[PDB]
Every structure is written in C-alpha cells, then in structure tokens.
Amino acid sequence: SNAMAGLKYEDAGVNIEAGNQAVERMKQHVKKTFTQDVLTGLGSFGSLYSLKNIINNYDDPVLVQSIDGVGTKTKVAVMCGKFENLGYDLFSAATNDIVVMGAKPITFLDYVAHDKLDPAIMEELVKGMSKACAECGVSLVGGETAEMPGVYQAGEIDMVGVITGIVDRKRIINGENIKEGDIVFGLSSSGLHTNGYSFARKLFFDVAGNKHTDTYPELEGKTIGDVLLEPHINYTNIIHDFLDNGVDIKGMAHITGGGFIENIPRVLPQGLGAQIDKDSFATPAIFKLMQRIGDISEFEMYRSFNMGIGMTIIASQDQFDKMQELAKKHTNTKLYQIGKITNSGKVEII
Amino acid sequence: AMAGLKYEDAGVNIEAGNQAVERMKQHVKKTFTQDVLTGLGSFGSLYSLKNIINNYDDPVLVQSIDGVGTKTKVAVMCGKFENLGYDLFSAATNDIVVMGAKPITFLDYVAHDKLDPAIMEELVKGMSKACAECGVSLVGGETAEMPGVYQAGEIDMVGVITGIVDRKRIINGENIKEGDIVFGLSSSGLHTNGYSFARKLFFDVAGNKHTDTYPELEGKTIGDVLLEPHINYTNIIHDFLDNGVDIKGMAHITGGGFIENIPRVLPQGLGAQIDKDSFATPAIFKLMQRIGDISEFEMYRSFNMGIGMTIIASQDQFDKMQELAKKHTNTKLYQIGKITNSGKVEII
Numbered sequence: 001s002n003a004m005a006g007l008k009y010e011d012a013g014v015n016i017e018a019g020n021q022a023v024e025r026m027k028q029h030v031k032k033t034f035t036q037d038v039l040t041g042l043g044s045f046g047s048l049y050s051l052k053n054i055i056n057n058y059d060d061p062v063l064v065q066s067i068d069g070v071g072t073k074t075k076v077a078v079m080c081g082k083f084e085n086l087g088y089d090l091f092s093a094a095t096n097d098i099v100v101m102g103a104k105p106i107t108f109l110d111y112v113a114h115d116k117l118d119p120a121i122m123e124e125l126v127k128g129m130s131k132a133c134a135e136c137g138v139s140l141v142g143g144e145t146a147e148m149p150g151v152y153q154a155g156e157i158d159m160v161g162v163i164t165g166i167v168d169r170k171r172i173i174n175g176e177n178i179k180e181g182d183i184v185f186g187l188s189s190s191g192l193h194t195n196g197y198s199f200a201r202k203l204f205f206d207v208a209g210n211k212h213t214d215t216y217p218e219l220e221g222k223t224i225g226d227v228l229l230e231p232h233i234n235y236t237n238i239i240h241d242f243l244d245n246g247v248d249i250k251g252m253a254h255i256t257g258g259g260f261i262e263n264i265p266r267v268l269p270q271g272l273g274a275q276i277d278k279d280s281f282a283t284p285a286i287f288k289l290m291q292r293i294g295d296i297s298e299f300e301m302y303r304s305f306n307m308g309i310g311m312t313i314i315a316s317q318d319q320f321d322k323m324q325e326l327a328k329k330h331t332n333t334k335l336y337q338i339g340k341i342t343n344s345g346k347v348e349i350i
Numbered sequence: 351a352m353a354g355l356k357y358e359d360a361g362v363n364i365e366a367g368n369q370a371v372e373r374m375k376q377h378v379k380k381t382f383t384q385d386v387l388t389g390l391g392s393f394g395s396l397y398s399l400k401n402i403i404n405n406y407d408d409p410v411l412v413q414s415i416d417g418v419g420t421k422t423k424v425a426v427m428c429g430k431f432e433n434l435g436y437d438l439f440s441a442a443t444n445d446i447v448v449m450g451a452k453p454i455t456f457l458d459y460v461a462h463d464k465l466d467p468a469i470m471e472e473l474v475k476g477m478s479k480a481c482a483e484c485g486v487s488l489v490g491g492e493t494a495e496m497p498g499v500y501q502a503g504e505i506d507m508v509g510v511i512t513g514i515v516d517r518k519r520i521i522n523g524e525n526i527k528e529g530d531i532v533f534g535l536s537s538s539g540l541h542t543n544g545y546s547f548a549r550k551l552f553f554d555v556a557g558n559k560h561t562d563t564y565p566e567l568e569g570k571t572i573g574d575v576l577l578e579p580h581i582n583y584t585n586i587i588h589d590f591l592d593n594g595v596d597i598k599g600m601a602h603i604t605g606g607g608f609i610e611n612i613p614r615v616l617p618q619g620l621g622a623q624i625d626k627d628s629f630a631t632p633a634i635f636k637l638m639q640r641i642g643d644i645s646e647f648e649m650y651r652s653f654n655m656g657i658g659m660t661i662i663a664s665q666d667q668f669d670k671m672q673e674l675a676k677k678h679t680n681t682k683l684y685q686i687g688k689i690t691n692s693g694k695v696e697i698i
C-alpha cells in the first residue's frame with residue numbers, strides 16, 4: 001500500500017536529515033542569540049519577539065527594517081573553503097543599513113539558497129550569523145533554506161538577511177540638521193566588506209593566476225584568501241555606545257558599493273557637499289595591492305571601493321572628544337576624522 | 351537645418367527615463383497606510399507602531415521569511431509574473447496568520463540571472479496588490495543581478511512578513527482536544543508547493559507544453575492553471591477571529607501537505623481523521639495523479655489536494671464560520687474531519 005512512483009523530485013525547502021549533528025549544533029548557535037524577550041515560535045528555528053520591554057521607553061516607537069544579500073563574496077568563500085565569517089558578513093550587510101538611522105536592531109531572519117550545500121557548511125554560516133547577532137543583542141528568530149538545482153548553478157549560493165530595529169520617532173537620524181562646517185568622521189573597514197568581490201576574485205585567481213594561500217608584498221605574510229574573507233564589520237555596538245552616551249550624531253552613511261561619492265549624498269541636505277581627505281585614514285593593504293597589480297588610478301579606486309572607511313558619521317567638531325574616548329573599547333574598528341561638510345553640493349575626495 | 355540630409359537617429363526610438371521603475375514605485379506607494387513614515391529616499395519607508403501600541407496589552411512581533419520554490423521556473427517559462435508576486439506575499443503571510451497575528455509590513459528581495467525592470471514591475475505589482483488587500487505596507491526591498499549564480503533566465507525571491515499579536519491571543523493549538531472538528535478552506539491550486547513534482551509530470555513524463563490543455567482543466571492552459579496565485583487567508587481569518595470564532599489551532603498546508611502540517615499544530619499524541627471526499631479536489635491534482643499513476647499517499651505527501659488552510663475548533667463554531675465566510679468569495683469553507691487520540695493522520 002501507499003507506493004511511490006520512483007520519480008525524481010523534491011520540495012525546495014526539504015530539511016536536513018534527522019540525526020545529522022548539524023541541526024542540533026545550529027539550534028545551539030541560534031539559542032545563544034535569544035534575549036529574555038524571545039518566545040517560542042513555529043518550525044525548527046522559529047521564535048517570536050515580545051515588544052513589552054523595548055517599547056516601554058518610546059512614545060512613538062518606529063519599526064525600521066531592511067533586507068540585503070551578501071553578494072559575490074560567496075564565490076570566494078567557496079573557493080577558499082572558509083565560511084567561518086560569511087554568516088557574519090551577511091548580518092553586517094543587512095544591519096549596518098539600519099544602524100545609520102539611529103535604530104536599535106532587535107531581530108534577524110535569514111534565507112540561504114543553493115544547488116547542493118554540505119550541512120557542515122550551513123552549520124558554519126549559521127554559527128557566523130549567530131555570533132554577530134549575539135554580540136549586539138539581536139535575536140535570530142527564523143530562517144529558511146532552498147535547494148533548487150534548476151535555479152542555481154552548481155556550487156553557487158545566495159544568502160539574504162532581514163534586520164528589524166526600533167527607534168523613537170523623534171530620535172530618527174536623517175541628516176536634516178547637517179550644516180557647512182560640520183565634520184565627517186569615519187570608522188575603519190576591515191577590507192572590501194561585501195562589495196567588489198567579482199573584481200577581486202577574477203583579478204587574483206583568473207587573471208593573476210594566484211592560489212588563495214599565496215601572499216604579496218603588501219600583505220606581509222597574510223594570505224590573499226584570509227585578507228579577502230575578513231568579515232564586514234558590525235557597527236551596531238560602537239554606534240549604540242556613541243548615541244547612548246550623548247554624542248550628537250547628525251547623520252551617518254554606510255559605505256557600500258560606489259564609495260564615498262555614491263553613499264554620502266543620501267544623508268546630506270540639499271545643496272550641501274562634503275570634502276574627504278583621503279590621506280587622513282589608512283587604506284587597507286588589500287586595496288593598495290589591488291590598485292598596484294591592476295594599474296588602477298586613484299580616482300577609479302575611490303569611485304568603486306570604501307578604501308578603508310566602512311561607515312561615516314557627521315557631527316560638529318566638538319563631538320570628537322566624547323567619540324574618541326568611547327571608541328577605545330571597540331577594538332574591531334578605528335575612529336578617524338576624515339573630512340568636512342561644505343556648500344558645494346558635491347562629494348569631493350582630496 | 352537644410353533639406354535632404356540624414357537625420358542621424360531616424361528609424362530608432364529609445365525610451366527615456368525609467369518608466370517601469372516609476373510604475374513600480376507607484377504600486378508600492380498604494381500599499382502605504384497612515385502608519386508609514388516617508389521621506390527617507392532610497393532606504394525605503396519606516397513604520398510607526400503608535401497605533402499598534404494603543405491596541406495591545408503585550409504586543410508580540412511575529413515574523414516569517416519564505417520563498418516560493420520552483421514555481422518561479424513555471425513563471426519564467428510562461429513569461430507571466432504578476433501572480434508570482436502575489437504568491438510570494440501569501441507564502442510568507444499565511445505562516446503568521448495561523449497564530450492570529452495581524453500582518454503589518456512586508457519586504458522582498460528578488461535576485462535575477464538578468465534583471466529586467468518590466469519583470470520586476472510585474473512582480474511588485476502582484477506583491478503590492480496582496481499587501482493592499484489586507485492592510486500591509488510594503489516598506490522596503492532589494493534586488494540582485496547574479497548571472498553566475500543563476501541558471502539562464504531564472505530568478506529567486508524572498509519575502510518577509512511582520513505582524514503583531516497580543517501575547518494572550520496567540521493561537522498555538524495547546525487547547526485542541528479529542529472531538530474537536532477540522533475545517534478546511536479551499537486552495538486555488540497547488541499554491542507554492544509540489545512544483546518540482548508538477549514540472550516533472552507535465553513537462554517530462556507527459557511531455558506537454560505549457561500552452562496545452564486537457565478537457566478536465568476546463569479550457570485553461572497548464573501554465574495558467576499552475577500559475578494561479580497562492581490564496582491570501584489574512585482577511586477571512588481576521589473576520590473569524592474579530593467576530594468571535596473560537597479558533598483552537600490552524601495549519602497552513604504547505605510542504606508535506608496534510609501529513610506534515612496538521613500534526614505540527616496538534617498536542618503530542620492527538621491525531622486527525624480527514625474525510626477526503628468532504629472537499630473538492632481541483633482537476634489539476636486528478637490530472638497529475640492520472641499522468642503519473644500516482645498513489646493516494648504520494649499525492650497527499652506533496653500536494654494540498656484542494657485545502658490551503660485548516661482550522662481546528664469545536665463543532666458549535668461551524669454555523670458562525672459559515673455565515674462569516676459568505677462574503678469571502680476567493681475561498682470556500684468545508685468541514686473536513688475531526689481530532690482523535692490516534693497519534694496519526696487517517697484519511698477516509
């Protein structure tokens with residue numbers, strides 16, 4: 001009775017076999033992200049989030065949400081066989097986009113799709129996401145996977161994350177008070193973050209013919225693979241620490257694709273510009289290396305890459321005092337003073 | 351300036367601006383309720399909870415992330431995408447509706463082998479239609495173009511629904527008991543599960559083209575039957591709950607069909623008896639069965655068989671539910687079974 005036809009097909013969301021050490025390990029990573037506000041939910045990784053505590057404070061609590069993917073960095077992780085940071089990359093890629101609003105991130109969900117994927121690799125992705133969540137008080141409340149060989153090319157993966165945060169309406173940061181003479185501050189990046197990896201991968205491994213274990217003069221022993229796979233920094237805690245301690249941040253911009261010129265204008269009031277002193281901050285070795293190998297102009301590098309600044313903060317000069325002191329405990333990034341606001345209407349790098 | 355000369359560009363017109371993108375933005379804006387905060391540009395919109403907070407003792411934020419599966423391949427094959435956007439919304443949203451949550455915001459990500467703004471416009475039209483029907487605001491999204499990741503012409507989509515429920519009102523099945531009744535609401539077709547099986551049957555086993563039809567599909571092409579959108583149960587479930595129907599549990603019939611999904615909401619040990627002839631099974635399922643000579647078990651293991659949502663409640667709730675269901679003309683209510691102490695699913 002109840003025969004099967006012997007045809008080849010499967011649900012996209014098929015789960016990983018029962019008993020695989022991976023699923024329990026993943027649940028253990030996920031549960032470390034929970035605050036006291038988390039309730040049981042639906043499915044293997046589903047939870048709910050009680051709002052009672054977080055909103056007690058706000059007269060008009062506002063929900064702030066954003067969804068983002070990792071992008072082509074996945075291909076480098078796969079080539080190197082190192083996924084330890086890629087889950088963390090995903091979290092930062094989504095979350096920094098709401099941090100700029102002054103929002104407090106509270107929940108995260110993720111989707112990972114592929115043709116085939118070793119459960120061991122998934123456990124590593126989840127470990128990394130959960131590490132990023134746990135460190136800044138975000139609860140990972142759900143996730144999904146899809147295995148679709150007729151959609152994904154062999155060995156390829158797409159990862160998407162959705163962050164949700166809360167801000168009091170009157171405390172939304174959107175740059176409206178920015179004025180000429182305000183200062184541009186920058187927090188260092190760890191390298192490319194999650195932009196530019198198609199170029200990086202092809203430059204080193206298809207054009208130059210390197211292996212990921214190779215090094216170069218600029219890297220002083222560190223491998224190309226390791227330098228490329230450094231995680232996109234999670235700026236949640238440092239920004240929270242600044243805001244919690246009364247730093248008057250007037251605007252922020254997360255430096256992703258298209259460098260300072262693409263990203264800073266969003267936050268500038270109409271008619272205002274910015275001037276960035278490129279020599280005021282360190283350019284990570286990986287950028288210096290790519291520029292040299294490729295015979296790429298300064299102009300074009302700054303057009304495309306973050307060049308060492310992953311987040312910008314606009315505030316009056318006298319806020320540097322408090323920021324510098326507060327930044328010391330945050331050892332994953334470095335605070336610089338990098339520029340100033342002008343009445344040019346343009347972002348200029350000098 | 352003088353006669354008889356070439357016009358450099360005579361014989362070629364190139365559409366200016368970004369007309370698909372602007373129409374897409376217009377569809378999104380129609381979803382906005384008064385709680386949406388705008389004027390933040392490229393980011394998306396924000397969402398004020400002030401009205402929520404007023405109306406809830408301990409509000410709980412309920413969220414779900416979902417894709418639609420390989421149904422996307424059928425949409426691509428047929429070149430039809432509006433229903434697929436609607437599919438995405440329903441696939442995510444129905445999974446929180448089962449807890450009694452009110453959906454409030456939706457975000458979407460769509461990745462493309464090659465991003466065509468006219469296809470995006472269509473997808474977003476469909477999502478926005480679903481949002482607007484049930485008071486959900488489409489507050490942001492993202493796209494990716496990844497030809498090295500995707501097979502030629504294919505896409506993948508992720509939707510995220512966010513809703514609110516009062517903690518005490520969370521429906522979780524804990525009060526289900528032996529003798530409670532299982533009710534079902536009709537589906538529109540396969541919804542968003544079983545498409546791998548469906549594509550294998552129609553396009554490989556039967557060797558049909560999506561433009562073919564069969565007498566039992568009542569004129570409609572295979573492609574169009576397959577592409578009917580996943581029903582959004584938000585409004586009918588809200589109608590039931592707002593008007594006093596004592597719902598003890600719900601199961602959204604997705605991957606694994608009745609067999610997987612009904613037991614998940616039952617207190618451990620309880621079972622269900624389902625009268626398979628108490629609800630209509632759309633012709634598409636009977637056709638697939640016939641093409642593949644598929645056993646009843648294999649059918650119920652993949653397909654919803656005509657019921658997209660199950661509701662467990664006492665027998666004496668049925669009268670009220672039938673009265674309330676009348677206005678909801680996109681789905682039909684049936685009484686389909688009962689709760690037992692069998693620890694399993696029995697189909698008679």
Ligand SMILES: Nc1ncnc2c1ncn2[C@@H]1O[C@H](COP(=O)(O)O)[C@@H](O)[C@H]1O
Nearest residue numbers: 391392393394458459460490491492493
């Ligand atoms: N998948 C999507 N759904 C809805 N809106 C989107 C989507 N992708 C981008 N947008 C909107 O398109 C505009 C520009 O997007 P971006 O290219 O990410 O800057 C913003 O208003 C976004 O909210």
